[PDB]
């Protein structure tokens, strides 16, 4: 009904390969910057990446459904690791399931999630679902405040699927990375802290934890003198 | 699973008997006689105590007769266990109908709702019947003074007198004998003590031996204290 | 509850307990009747209830129900404790969704010949409905000790036509009840 | 009659007399005896089956931390109302702010198995439970339930085929010290009591791994690992 | 708003009701007649909220015929109104009350009496010589307080009544398209003017 | 309300105020707030009195279920348990918990149950009305595996401020120390804490 | 005991439920099934009967996971034992939720014990017709239980059911008098194998395909696995040259 | 539970052979007596050990129901021990907490019977194997005591027996009781009875004994409460029953 | 109201104002407000009176039933946590605020109950309108090492500066005393500071002042 730990926006976009997803590492507490631990990229297998924002009690709930779903797959299942792994648009079809009921019954999971992945053919996946249950795919896509200032960057990168395959890992990497940081300049539940997936058909899955916004400036600030009239 | 076990009760015999009902009629048979008179005046009720001895409470044993309300009461033979439940029942529903409509209920609409009871575990639920059957001695405006009967099949009949338990060929055959319709209250009181006299089973009939009830005219309601039965009983001759 | 008005007063005397009520049926402003007895009795129990009429209706009639059953079962009428008893859980039963009503019991019991009121056991006397403040201050005035049955009648009747003359919402007439363990007189007052 | 618990004509219920039948099925004695401020409960362990795993075969439960018992009869049943007795006395503990009494663990465990006894659709359980602990108020405290929903506290008990032979003994000790319990300040040496007299009751030595031993104490109730048993077993070679 | 009034007489009871029906803006209706027959000897007339009056009024009319078909006996009016005042003080505590007021009009034939209950929606009954539900006792009840004579003839009863209609024509600012006028007595029931 | 709880060297130290209000009135001034659930398990309560005591009796009888059954309980198990209660009522309870507990492998663990219901495993945590005041104070302060008597003091200053800047934060300071060694109380009264 | 073998629940005069002792010969009937706990694990085996050579190998897979810990392995009715492995998933599940930590290995099998035993309790249901093998790693180690379609289990350091047991237990008893220092994962792997294949020197009116399974915290980082490929051919290999 | 029919059914002969076999297993049971006085009630029996081992202290074949009401029984203890449990929830649910006070015997004894009565004819059970024998006091009708049998039938008595000894002991009773007896009398007239029935040892470790007497304030645990009676329900004492029994 | 709660060396005592108020008008003037759970377990209550005796009621009879089921005389500690998690399922709706002291085998216990079902121990307490004078009075008076007559004392003294002090609270004081090992003293109206003067003139009226229209004898 209220949210009261909250994560902030996850950001994410296709490249040539695959997918990159990242969220920063904070749970903030209203304006309490609280804990500053919180994973909030969960991957699932080694083909997708579940990035979610929004109340963390919700988030840790859908944690615990994504491995209670790897678990059952398994059962009974000698591919489990083949050809009947769960793929991105399973994990995904199943959360949007759940967010949609949920809504239905007026008890919404309070959050906003991003499901990354690579399909077994190879295709990028990536796709947004809310608390409402309302879905979308775009070759960008992001949460939150991240939706105002990120997706415009990203989308001067990759404005539409024909510019995936233009787009290699470096330079969408180094999108999300200025993203972050533009975020930690401008969201004020922001950490400079920061996890980054990339999903790779070729390289699988790579996580990378404990990154930090980097090069940020600030130097000019010294310039700026009152409000109007102070010289 | 349980099928093995269950008895069928509510099953047809061939001849389209109820056995359960005919076999808990046999147990009454066995039960204290039970009269009802109904006078011009009035109604008697009547029975005789088949448990019987010395160190018995008959002064505050009351077994066979019960008020069902200010108007209705009735007389038991049978399982004495089973009619408590009845009566609480009919008491209840007594109580409804007063609430209802702020009228006394009428003594067939009591009558049919506690057969009706009687009937349904005749029919359903696999349970075993009630073994008990009423006499009902009450007053309405409607009717007046009305005796009925009930046993464990759910029917009910009106009668002017009636008897049940043990000897009631017997006690129909004397009551046929000497019943007249104009009879007062006081010569129902002696033909019902007269017809238990000679129908019981004992030695001789005893004011210990005895419960007696009347209803008579508003309407009032008599359980008699075991003196006035001893007072009725050396007034009839029989003690 | 005050949209039907009315008021119920009790007392005690030397062997003996008044209750007393007015006879008005409103709805607000509109006076419906003056035979509306709020005054009930259950054998030698008396039960005055105050407040919304259908609940007095509705309440009187389910005591009636289980006092009836009380003496089928226990073969004896319901005495004035047991009955005040079982007006605290009947009316409790509803705790939630309450009947919006100001029970007063008076009788005498039979086995002591104590005389009792309750609305406990405030022995003196007791008030209730929408004068209730007026008939507080009437009885702490007049009240005595062990007033004889016509000085307890005196009594109880100035407070209830002194009280009810200060609430537009009661009167038109009042009954007042003398009940002693061998006998209870109805009386009349006229209002002015 | 013979397969539900319902009424033989002798007023029999077969149905309990073959479920103490099974409690005898593990071929399994059980003794246990009051100290002055312990209960002490010996089990017999038989096991044959080299491939079995011994830490796991054991007939003691540990029902509360105050809370022993010891069963007799059938392992599945034993754990059954070992799981029972467990939820019913953390629940007594969370309804009524204390520990349950082993009396009335017994009392509620004892009350179940006559529902047992009295509803056709739940068979006995096999089993025998000897509850065990020092309680706040009564002190050391040995209550055994049976599938009757009999129950009693015990000065000592023992159960089993030769449960007559362990308690002859122990009567004529109570004969020879005109005592109620153990006169012995501590629970070492009312296990070694307890053994010794199995041992001279059975005819039999035990091996460490031949018994299984529980000791309630006002703290806890606690079960002897095997060495702790060598301990004892070797004090009364040399005591 | 509807008008129902009753008067008590002698030996009759008059029911009163008025004729329209309002919908919003418009007069739908001229010619309703807001009462049920309940028994040979007995009349109800309702009025409250739209729909509820007369979903109301048909159960009642339906569990009364029951009952006389089951019984073989007409409820006298007493029993009558005592059973509609159960089922009002119910629906009070119901997830939705019948918000209608009652007036039973009934000929005892056992007392040979007529007989007038006056029932809000609340199940206050109140056994009256003359009664009316809402604003039309506002207008009525000090003719009727003036003039009513216990011993009246059903015709100065009706002469009483078109004064009570006369006066709330005159007074009362809605136009209710008169009144439809019943008599129970030891006939039955009839229709008068 | 002002609690805490630290894992240090030897295992974890749970402190409180003792102070209880309702609105500006000091309901009880010798509350204790550190609730065991289980032996060397305990949790620190801030938030509604009676939704937290409601759920410490709940997880307390769930946790002796669990021992007769399986066990000892983990912390972690305890912290779930909680969790399970706190967010499954998140509607109706407004409890904050920190949970704290000792055990010979993971020594000294510390989980906070804010509300909401998400758990959070910390070196430290703090919590109530007068956490707010020492945040700054607790994060220059703390350091890993620090002595008992380093660990006591560290929570003696840190609610000594607490107390001094909130009025619903009082009294006495109540600690739980947790080791293998056992379960120690320790009391610590205004006049030695506001000398700091 | 003619009387009161008809319906389940019932003690005979002697104090026995025969519909037990008759879904006992159940299990008795069905393939050999055998558990062997390691030094730091739990192998598990079964005989799965080539009927005709219509089946598809290696597709039929008899051995179940349990979370991702436990494995279970049964003799007698089939779907028996699926149904009693998803009661015990249910209970993993459940347990896991409440406490996050995966079920305790004897915390399972009470729970299965106890859905055993309640399948004893009333007439309105039959026994389960399966004994159970299963294990697993948790933290205190390895464990392996058997479980009877009475309810009772016990620990074990190997077991054996169905038609091939007596062999099998035999085979079992000397590898553990041989062993007392505790075998190796994979060498109780290539036990597992020889023993089967010598249970099948019973029942050998029809060919058979092995499978195997183990949970071990060095081979598999005490997660349940199927045993596949090169060490499923050199456990077979090793089975058939220690017959021939 | 598929046992939603009757397993006690009528007989062609119209016996409820269930109950009769209640009966038998109440009349194969330790003898229970009753005794009215004046001016109070006995019940008293005789404890049979299972064991020499076990503590007869522990296990109360006489249980108070209310303060003033106690019940005995004969036949099979388990279901008197839940017969109790129902019985005292009974008088508080259905008496206690409507009318502020506790049932009269009459009452209480009514609602065991009843109890009993739905054994003999609802789904899937068996009667009780007991009798029970119900001592009381109430303020309007005095002492009372009460047998209650397996088909929920129940009679005042002014003293009875059940169980084994129950003829020999009624015609003791019959011999001796008379409406002046006192019920120190009463009590001596118990003991003689139980004395002729018991299996030969007979002292206050064998016998259970309580009264339905005076009101006792030293049991009521509290003072200042004038109108609060203290209970009339009192077990003897083991050394009571042997001041008694060598005064004999 | 006003109700304390003392601990003393050893026992407990509880008192409580006499008068209940229907607003600002005093209903009753003598009130008991001293409830008995047990023999040795008695209970006072603030807020709503009728809910306060409907669950001193309810809970008296379960600890009746569950002391006759355990043999054993019933512990403080149960009627607290039966209350309490009563309480707790009405979450508040039940008004009740309640003292419970009594003495069991475990010894002297003092608890308050709120009406959301929380609760807290304490050597000395109290409750109601005039709770914040008496907890004054304890406060300033109070020690550890009180006997028997110093904490009646106490407690009337407490309870007599909520009745001069809170007009919700009057007239008498009534104490109940638990010591262990003894039977409870309940002592009823223990003082009476408020006993009205005598009215200036006698207001009986003479026989016949009032009015009457008629008469009739009611059978009964």
């Not at chain 2, 009760?9 to 001849?15: A, H, L, R």
């Not at chain 7, 305790?104 to 099998?109: E, G, N, R």
Request: glycine share 8%.
């Amino acid at each position: 009904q209220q949210p009261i730990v909250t994560g902030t926006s996850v950001i994410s976009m296709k490249y040539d390969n695959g997918v990159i997803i990242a969220a920063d590492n904070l749970g903030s507490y209203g304006s309490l910057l609280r804990f500053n631990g919180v994973e909030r990229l969960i991957p699932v297998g080694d083909n997708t990446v579940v990035g979610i924002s929004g109340d963390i009690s919700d988030m840790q709930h859908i944690e615990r459904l994504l491995k209670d779903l790897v678990t059952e797959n398994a059962y009974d299942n000698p591919l489990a690791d083949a050809e009947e792994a769960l793929e991105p648009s399973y994990i995904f079809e199943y959360l949007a399931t759940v967010m949609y009921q949920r809504r239905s019954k007026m008890n919404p999971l309070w959050n906003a999630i991003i499901v990354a992945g690579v399909q077994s053919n190879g295709d990028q996946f990536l796709r947004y679902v809310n608390l409402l249950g309302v879905t979308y795919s775009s070759p960008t896509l992001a949460t939150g405040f991240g939706a105002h200032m990120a997706n415009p960057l990203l989308r001067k990168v990759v404005d539409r699927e024909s510019d995936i395959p233009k787009t290699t890992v470096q330079v969408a990497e180094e999108a999300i990375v200025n993203a972050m940081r533009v975020l930690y300049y401008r969201d004020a539940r922001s950490s400079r802290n920061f996890s980054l997936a990339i999903i790779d058909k070729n390289t699988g899955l790579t996580f990378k934890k404990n990154l930090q916004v980097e090069n940020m400036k600030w130097d000019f600030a010294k310039d700026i003198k009152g409000y109007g009239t102070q010289k | 699973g349980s099928r093995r076990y269950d008895s069928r009760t509510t099953i047809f015999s061939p001849e389209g008997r109820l056995y359960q009902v005919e076999y808990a009629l046999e147990s009454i048979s066995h039960a204290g006689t039970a009269i009802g008179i109904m006078a011009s005046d009035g109604i008697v009720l009547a029975a005789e105590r088949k448990v019987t001895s010395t160190l018995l409470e008959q002064d505050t044993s009351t077994e066979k007769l019960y008020k069902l309300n200010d108007k209705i009461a009735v007389a038991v033979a049978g399982l004495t266990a089973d009619a408590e439940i009845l009566i609480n029942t009919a008491r209840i529903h007594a109580q409804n109908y007063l609430k209802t409509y702020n009228e006394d209920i009428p003594v067939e609409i009591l009558v049919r709702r506690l057969s009706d009871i009687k009937q349904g575990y005749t029919q359903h639920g696999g349970l075993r019947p009630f073994g008990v059957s009423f006499i009902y001695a009450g007053y309405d405006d409607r009717y007046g003074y009305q005796l009925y009967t009930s046993n464990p099949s759910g029917n009910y009949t009106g009668w002017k007198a009636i008897s049940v338990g043990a000897n009631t060929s017997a006690a129909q055959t004397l009551l046929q004998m000497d019943y007249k319709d104009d009879m007062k209250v006081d010569d129902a009181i002696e033909l019902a003590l007269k017809t238990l006299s000679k129908t019981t089973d004992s030695s001789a009939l005893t004011y210990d031996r005895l419960e007696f009830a009347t209803i008579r005219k508003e309407v009032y309601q008599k359980i008699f204290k075991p003196q006035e039965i001893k007072d009725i009983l050396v007034k009839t001759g029989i003690t | 509850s005050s949209i039907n008005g009315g008021i119920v007063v009790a007392m005690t005397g030397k062997d003996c307990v008044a209750i007393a009520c007015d006879l008005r049926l409103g709805s607000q402003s509109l006076g419906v009747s003056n035979k509306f007895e709020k005054i009930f009795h259950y054998g030698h129990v008396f039960l005055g209830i105050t407040g919304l009429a259908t609940d007095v209706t509705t309440l009187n009639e389910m005591f009636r129900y289980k006092t009836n059953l009380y003496k089928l079962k226990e073969e004896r009428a319901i005495e004035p404790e047991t009955f005040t008893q079982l007006v605290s859980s009947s009316l409790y039963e509803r705790r939630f969704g309450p009947y919006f009503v100001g029970p007063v019991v008076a009788g005498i019991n039979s086995k002591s010949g104590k005389p009792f009121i309750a609305g406990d056991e405030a022995k003196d006397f007791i008030v209730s409905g929408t004068a209730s403040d007026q008939l507080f201050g009437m009885c702490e005035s007049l009240y005595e000790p062990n007033l004889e049955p016509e000085d307890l009648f005196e009594t109880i009747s100035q407070a209830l036509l002194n009280a009810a003359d200060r609430d537009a919402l009661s009167g038109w007439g009042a009954v007042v009840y003398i009940i002693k363990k061998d006998e209870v007189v109805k009386r009349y007052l006229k209002m002015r | 009659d013979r397969h539900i618990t319902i009424f033989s004509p002798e007023g029999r219920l077969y149905q309990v007399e073959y479920a103490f039948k099974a409690t005898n099925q593990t071929n399994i004695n059980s003794l246990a005896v009051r100290g002055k401020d312990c209960t002490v409960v010996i089990s017999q362990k038989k096991v044959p089956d080299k491939l079995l795993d011994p830490t796991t075969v054991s007939y003691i439960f540990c029902i509360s931390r105050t809370i022993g018992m010891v069963v007799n009869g059938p392992i599945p049943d034993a754990r059954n109302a070992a799981l029972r007795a467990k939820a019913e006395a953390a629940e007594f503990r969370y309804k009524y702010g204390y520990d349950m009494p082993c009396d009335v663990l017994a009392k509620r465990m004892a009350n179940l198995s006559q529902i047992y006894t009295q509803r056709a659709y739940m068979r006995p359980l096999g089993v025998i439970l000897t509850f065990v602990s020092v309680d706040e108020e009564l002190g050391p405290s040995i209550y055994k339930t049976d599938p009757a929903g009999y129950y009693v506290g015990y000065k000592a008990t023992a159960t089993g085929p030769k449960q007559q032979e362990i308690t002859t003994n122990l009567e004529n000790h109570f004969k020879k010290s005109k005592i109620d319990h153990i006169n012995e300040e501590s629970w070492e040496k009312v296990v070694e009591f307890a053994i010794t007299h199995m041992i001279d009751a059975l005819g039999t030595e035990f091996s460490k791994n031949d018994l299984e031993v529980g000791v309630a104490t006002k703290d806890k109730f606690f079960t002897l690992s095997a060495e702790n048993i060598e301990e004892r077993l070797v004090a009364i070679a040399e005591q | 708003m509807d008008i129902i009034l009753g008067i008590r007489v002698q030996d009759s009871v008059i029911l009163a009701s008025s004729k329209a029906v309002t919908r919003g803006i418009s007069v739908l209706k001229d010619s309703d007649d807001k009462t049920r027959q309940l028994s040979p000897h007995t009349l109800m007339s309702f009025a409250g909220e739209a729909g509820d009056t007369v979903q109301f009024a048909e159960y009642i009319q339906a569990n009364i015929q029951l009952y006389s078909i089951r019984e073989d006996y007409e409820l006298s009016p007493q029993a009558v109104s005592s059973f509609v005042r159960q089922e009002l003080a119910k629906s009070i505590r119901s997830r939705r009350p019948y918000q209608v007021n009652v007036l039973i009009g009934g000929y005892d034939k056992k007392k040979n009496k007529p007989e007038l209950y006056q029932i809000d929606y609340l199940g206050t009954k109140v056994e009256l010589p003359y009664g009316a539900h809402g604003y039309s006792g506002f207008y009525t009840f000090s003719l009727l307080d003036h003039h009513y004579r216990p011993d009246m003839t059903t015709e100065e009863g009706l002469d009483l009544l078109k004064l009570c209609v006369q006066e709330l024509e005159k007074r009362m600012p809605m136009d209710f398209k008169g009144v439809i006028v019943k008599i129970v007595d030891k006939d039955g029931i009839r229709q008068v003017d | 309300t002002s609690i805490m709880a630290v894992t240090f060297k030897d295992g974890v130290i749970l402190g409180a105020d003792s102070r209880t209000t309702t609105g500006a009135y000091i309901a009880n001034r010798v509350t204790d707030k550190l609730t065991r659930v289980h032996d060397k398990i305990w949790c620190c309560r801030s938030g509604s009195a009676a939704d937290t005591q409601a759920i410490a009796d709940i997880v307390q009888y769930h946790l002796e279920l669990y021992t007769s059954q399986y066990g000892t309980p983990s912390t972690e198990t305890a912290a779930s348990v909680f969790k399970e209660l706190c967010y499954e009522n998140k509607d109706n309870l407004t409890a904050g918990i920190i949970v704290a507990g000792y055990d010979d492998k993971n020594k000294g663990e510390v989980y906070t149950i804010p509300l909401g219901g998400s758990v959070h495993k910390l070196p430290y945590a703090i919590a109530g009305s007068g956490s707010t005041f020492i945040y700054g104070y607790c994060d220059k302060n703390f350091r890993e595996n620090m002595s008992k008597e380093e660990t006591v003091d560290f929570i003696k200053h840190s609610l000594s401020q607490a107390i001094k800047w909130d009025g619903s934060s009082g009294g006495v300071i109540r600690m739980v120390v947790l080791t293998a060694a056992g379960v120690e109380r320790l009391i610590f009264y205004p006049d030695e804490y506001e000398q700091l | 005991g003619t009387g009161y073998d008809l319906s389940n629940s019932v003690f005979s005069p002697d104090g026995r439920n025969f519909q037990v002792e008759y879904a006992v010969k159940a299990v008795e009937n069905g393939t050999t099934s055998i558990g062997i706990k390691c030094n730091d694990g739990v192998v598990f085996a079964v005989e799965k009967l080539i009927t005709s050579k219509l089946l598809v190998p290696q597709k039929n897979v008899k051995i179940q996971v349990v979370d991702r810990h436990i494995g279970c392995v049964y003799s007698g009715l089939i779907p028996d034992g699926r149904h009693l492995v998803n009661r015990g998933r249910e209970e993993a599940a459940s347990f896991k939720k409440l406490y996050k930590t995966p079920i305790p290995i004897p915390a399972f099998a009470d729970r299965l014990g106890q859905y055993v035993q309640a399948h004893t309790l009333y007439n309105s249901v039959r026994p389960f017709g399966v004994s159970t093998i299963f294990g697993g790693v948790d933290k205190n180690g390895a464990h392996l239980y058997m479980l009877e379609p009475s309810g009772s289990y016990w620990g074990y350091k190997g077991a054996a059911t169905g038609k091939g047991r007596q062999s099998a237990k035999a085979e079992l008893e000397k590898l553990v008098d041989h062993h007392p220092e505790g075998l190796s994962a994979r060498e109780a792997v290539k036990q597992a194998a020889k023993i089967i294949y010598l249970a099948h020197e019973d029942n050998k009116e029809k060919d058979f395909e092995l499978e195997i399974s183990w949970c071990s915290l060095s081979e598999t980082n005490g997660l349940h696995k199927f045993v596949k490929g090169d060490l499923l051919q050199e456990a077979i290999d090793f089975a058939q040259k220690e017959i021939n | 539970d598929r046992y939603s029919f009757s397993l006690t059914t009528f007989s062609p002969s119209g016996k409820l052979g269930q109950i009769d076999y209640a009966l038998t297993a109440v009349k194969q049971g330790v003898t229970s007596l009753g005794i009215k006085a004046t001016n109070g009630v006995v019940i008293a029996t005789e404890k049979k050990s299972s064991s020499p081992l076990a503590m007869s202290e522990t296990l109360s074949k006489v249980s108070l129901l209310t303060p003033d009401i106690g019940a005995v029984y004969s036949g099979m203890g388990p279901d008197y021990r839940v017969l109790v449990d129902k019985s005292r929830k009974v008088a508080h649910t259905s008496y206690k907490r409507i009318y502020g006070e506790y049932p009269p015997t009459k009452l209480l004894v009514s609602e065991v019977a009843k109890i009993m009565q739905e054994a003999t004819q609802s789904g899937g059970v068996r009667p009780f194997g007991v009798s029970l024998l119900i001592a009381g006091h109430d303020e309007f009708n005095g002492f009372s005591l009460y047998q209650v049998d397996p088909s929920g039938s129940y009679f005042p008595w002014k003293a009875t027996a059940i169980g084994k000894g129950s003829v020999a002991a009624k015609t003791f009773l019959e011999k001796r009781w008379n409406d002046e007896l006192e019920l120190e009398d009463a009590i001596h007239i118990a003991l003689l009875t139980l004395k002729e029935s018991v299996e030969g040892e007979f002292n206050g470790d064998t016998i259970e004994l309580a009264i339905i007497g005076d009101e006792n304030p030293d049991l009521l645990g509290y003072t200042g409460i004038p109108t609060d009676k203290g209970p009339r329900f009192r077990k003897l004492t083991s050394q009571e029953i042997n001041d008694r029994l060598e005064a004999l | 109201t006003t109700i304390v709660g003392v601990k003393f060396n050893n026992g407990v005592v509880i008192a409580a104002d006499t008068r209940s108020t229907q607003g600002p008008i005093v209903a009753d003037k003598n009130c008991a407000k001293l409830h008995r759970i047990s023999p040795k377990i008695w209970c006072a209550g603030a807020g709503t009176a009728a809910d306060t005796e409907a669950v001193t009621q309810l809970i008296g009879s379960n600890i009746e039933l569950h002391s006759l089921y355990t043999s054993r005389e019933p512990r403080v500690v149960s009627a607290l946590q039966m209350l309490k998690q009563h309480l707790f399922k009405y979450q508040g709706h039940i008004g009740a605020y309640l003292i419970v002291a009594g003495v069991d085998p475990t010894g002297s216990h003092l608890f308050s109950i709120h009406a959301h079902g929380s609760t807290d121990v304490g050597y000395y307490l109290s409750l109601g309108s005039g709770s914040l004078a008496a907890m004054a009075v304890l406060e300033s008076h109070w020690k550890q090492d009180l006997t028997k007559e110093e904490a009646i004392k106490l407690a009337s003294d407490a309870i007599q500066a909520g009745i001069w002090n809170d007009l919700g609270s009057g007239s008498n004081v009534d104490v109940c005393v638990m010591e262990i090992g003894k039977d409870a003293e309940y002592l009823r109206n223990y003082l009476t500071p408020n006993v009205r003067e005598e009215k200036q003139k006698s207001y009986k009226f003479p026989r016949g002042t009032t009015a009457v229209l008629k008469e009739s004898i009611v059978n009964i």
